[PDB]
Write a protein that binds this ligand. Structure first.
Ligand SMILES: CC1(C)CC[C@H](CO)N(c2ncnc3[nH]ccc23)C1
Length: 167
């Protein structure tokens, strides 16, 4: 039993809700919140920009030190950093950005990072400003993640379309 509330159950391990991931994280304070990161951990917009703003830019400061030490992530890769005031940990995961020409096949590799954590709060990878089809992203999530994932979908219209079209 966990403190996630109001989710629709899609499968044995995947749950979905129309919610702002920032507000969800502040309420639940989960062990792991997933960020829709880029390889440089530049948290300028979308989910990443919103999460960073909620940390008063502490996420960006930590991220800049991480990159200075380690260099950029791989597309499809991830790193674990602090969750600041939002969660214990933040799993920064890089899904392919279709608006940069990146291979959508890497979306499965991106979701595989979730399997290293027993429970996560997460957005749909590569959705929003990353330019991928969110229905497809949900399909890959369900077919790849085996741990317990609680998906927050910000757009209410998009949430209803994902539920109604789910197979
Ligand atoms: C374009 C979106 C409405 C759809 C998919 C992603 C990840 O779920 N989106 C978010 N989902 C949940 N919380 C969020 N906060 C800021 C953006 C955001 C944007």
């Amino acid at each position: 039993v966990n403190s996630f509330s109001g989710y629709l159950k899609l499968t044995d391990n995947v749950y979905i809700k129309n919610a702002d991931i920032v507000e969800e994280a502040k309420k639940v304070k989960p062990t792991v919140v997933v960020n829709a990161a880029n390889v440089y951990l530049k948290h300028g917009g979308g989910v990443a920009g919103a999460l960073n703003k909620a940390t008063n830019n502490a996420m960006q400061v930590e991220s800049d030190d991480y990159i200075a030490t380690n260099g950029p992530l791989k597309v499809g890769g991830s790193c674990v950093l602090s969750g600041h005031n939002l969660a214990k940990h933040c799993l920064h995961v890089v899904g392919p950005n279709v608006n940069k020409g990146e291979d959508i096949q890497l979306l499965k590799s991106a979701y595989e990072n979730f399997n290293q954590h027993e429970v996560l709060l997460a957005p749909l990878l590569s959705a929003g400003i990353f330019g991928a089809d969110p229905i497809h992203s949900l399909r890959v999530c369900v077919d790849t993640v085996r741990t317990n994932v609680y998906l927050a979908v910000f757009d209410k219209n998009l949430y209803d379309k994902l539920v109604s079209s789910f197979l």
